[PDB]
Paper text:
Two-component pathways comprise sensor histidine kinases (HPK) and response regulators (RRs). Once phosphorylated, the HPK transfers the phosphoryl group to an aspartate residue within the receiver domain of the cognate RR.
To show that the conclusions drawn from the unphosphorylated structure are also valid for the physiologically relevant, phosphorylated complex, we solved the structure of phosphorylated CheA3P1 in complex with [name]. Since the rapid rate of phosphotransfer between CheA3P1-P and [name] does not allow crystallization of the wild-type, phosphorylated complex, we formed a stable, complex by introducing two substitutions, D56N and S83A, in the active site of [name]. These substitutions have previously been shown to abolish phosphotransfer from CheA3P1-P. The structure was solved to 2.8 Å by molecular replacement using the unphosphorylated structure as model. Due to the moderate resolution of the analysis, residues 60–65, 85–97, and 111–121 on [name] could not be traced and were not included in the final model. Consistent with this, we find very little change in the total buried surface area between the phosphorylated (605 Å2) and unphosphorylated (530 Å2) structures of CheA3P1 complexed with [name].
Author numbering:
A (entry chain A): 8 to 135
B (entry chain B): 1 to 59, 66 to 84, 98 to 110, 122 to 134
The structure:
């Protein structure tokens, strides 16, 4: 079980670093086409690992990110500065969530991530 | 028995979780772990005695694999091609469908 959590911290970082890199590149001035896919795979990997260890709170916060990205990829909604902004705030929140869950070997309370869940929910409704 | 199994998934964490579960099974044994399609070919070329292949949706390989081995392919999701489909585990159900595929 010690190696499983070590792999969760490793894969989690590799996915979040890739998630941050794609959003920072979009923020720098790069087309969505080249970055929409890389970050969906980054969020899909992070949500998958959390679901495996039963990290319900970490899985739920990652799931809403996947829905918003999914609206850009599948539904065809423009990835405006606001989408990038929320997902960059999500990247830093999930970074704090990953570091906490790895050290504790249990899920987070999610009280300090309630603002992000509503921030994501606000945009998903506004796009739909 | 024990049946030789191969894990195919891009995330190392998922591969280890499945490998940890098969480690507890006395009728199944893990012989290969692969991150990509090409890696799965290299491992399959090394071990021809593979009985079952646990393949993930996205990382093409199924086309090359069937020409190399007669092993039963099973899909993992968090439709067409593979013999059966199992949902990815969350911390039992997999053990039932793994056994039913080997019996037929």
């Amino acid at each position: 079980m010690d190696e499983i959590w070590a792999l969760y911290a490793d894969d989690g970082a590799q996915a979040l670093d890739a998630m941050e890199a794609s959003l920072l590149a979009l923020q720098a001035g790069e087309d969505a086409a080249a970055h929409v896919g890389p970050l969906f795979r980054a969020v899909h990997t992070f949500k998958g690992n959390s679901r495996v260890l039963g990290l319900s709170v970490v899985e739920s916060r990652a799931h809403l990110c996947e829905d918003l990205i999914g609206l850009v990829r599948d539904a065809g909604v423009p990835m405006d500065g606001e989408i990038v902004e929320i997902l960059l705030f999500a990247s830093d929140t999930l970074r704090a969530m990953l570091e906490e869950t790895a050290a504790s070997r249990a899920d987070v309370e999610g009280t300090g991530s309630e603002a992000l869940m509503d921030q994501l929910r606000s945009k998903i409704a506004r796009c739909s | 028995s024990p049946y030789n199994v191969m894990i195919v998934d891009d995330a190392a964490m998922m591969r280890l979780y499945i490998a940890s579960f098969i480690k507890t099974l006395p009728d199944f044994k893990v012989v290969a772990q692969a991150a990509n399609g090409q890696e799965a070919l290299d491992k399959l070329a090394a071990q021809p005695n593979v009985d079952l292949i646990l393949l993930n949706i996205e990382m093409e390989f199924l086309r090359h694999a069937k020409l190399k081995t007669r092993a039963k392919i099973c899909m993992l999701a968090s439709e067409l091609g593979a013999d059966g489909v199992v949902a990815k585990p969350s911390g039992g159900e997999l053990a039932r469908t793994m056994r039913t595929l080997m019996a037929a």
